[model samples]
Target: MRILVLGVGNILLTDEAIGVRIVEALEQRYILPDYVEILDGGTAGMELLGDMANRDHLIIADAIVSKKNTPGTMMILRDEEVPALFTNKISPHQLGLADVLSALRFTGEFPKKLTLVGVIPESLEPHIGLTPTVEAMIEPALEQVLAALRESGVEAIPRSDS
Candidate 1:
């Protein structure tokens, strides 16, 4: 099965970039399957559509400014429930998640499964580190992504170069 795991955010903006950091950590620590493509997408989440196509599953991680929970809180959202802000045409990324997905569909790039893992961040300021709360949530978010992939039939294969 084709699988794509993307890390997205603007690392220059502290908590706003937690997702990219987490994905980087995972990339360094985990031995993903040969079929798994892990990317440090940074603020280029919108470009995801161009690099990946006809994937069986797509997992995304990002930092979000939400009031629903404290910093470090993890949220798993369905494709339809993802905030419309990801689709706004005026976003700095040029194409938000919504538009990217729509574009993918328009171009017949729909994946069989899609998942979004978002972390609530405490600060969006320009900084080099994450707050303690957000820092603590990163591991859980990583685990959650692994779990999600497993459930989708993407097993953790042995770490070996074939």
Candidate 2:
């Protein structure tokens, strides 16, 4: 199956940039199979329709904010459950994400299997880098991504030197 690991968010905002950071980190640290494609979506909503539609499986990683969860918490949502988890908008790209999914579903091109790996943000304030708390979540989030790939029978190995 053609699998996509899409990281979406605005990189200019501190904790908000977790998605982009995760993508970059994964690209640098892992040796992925040809069927697995990693993309840094960076708030490019509808523009991603073609890419999203082409995937048989989709995994997304981004920063999320849940009033009930503590910062740096990692949460996984599958398929339909993914949309519901974004009820509270924490970043500008979220609404666009909903629309992207909706459009795909409307056209019957949405991936049959999908998962969202999200990290709760400690601070959304404008900044260049992640706070210590949020930065700590990257490795764990990457683990989740690896787990998802393994579950789907795709093997990914860490680069010897990254």
- Stretches of candidate 2 above 4 Å error? 160-162
In candidate 2, clashing pairs total 0
lDDT of each residue in 1-162, candidate 1, tens digit only:
888888887778777677887778777777887888888877776677686567888887887665445667788876565545355453344246666777777898777777778788777777868888888878898887888788777766434434
Q: lDDT of each model, Cα atoms only?
A: 0.73, 0.82
| Candidate 2 lDDT by residue in tens digits, 87-133 | 56654577667777877888889997889888888878777788899
Off by over 4 Å in 1: 83-95, 157-162
Clash pairs detected, candidate 1: none
Model 2 CA RMSD to the hidden true structure, in angstroms? 1.8
Error of 1 at 31 (Å): 0.8
The local lDDT score (0 to 100) that residue 20 gets in candidate 1 is: 82
